[PDB]
Structure 1
Amino acid sequence: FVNQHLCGSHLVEALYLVCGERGFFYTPKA
């Protein structure tokens, strides 16, 4: 789930599940 290589939609989904109602920000290039 969380402890693996998470890329693209897979990473976005992990952030969605973990952050919940707090939301999150995804910055690919930073």
Structure 2
Amino acid sequence: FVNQHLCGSHLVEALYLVCGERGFFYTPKT
């Protein structure tokens, strides 16, 4: 739980850089 909570921090961190202007909707409950 904590590890994937730690891992989720870097994913949204990565999504911000990769997507750029596109943006994204982060949803953990799926």
TM-score, reference length from structure 1? 0.63
Residues paired across the two proteins, number:
30
What percentage of residue pairs aligned between the two structures are identical? 97
**Structure with greater strand percent:** 2
Cα RMSD of the aligned pairs, angstroms, is 5.5
TM-score, reference length from structure 2? 0.63
| Gapped regions of structure 2 (runs ≥ 5) | none
After TM superposition, where is structure 1 displaced by more than 2 Å over at least 4 residues in a row?
1-6
**Structure with greater helix percent:** 2
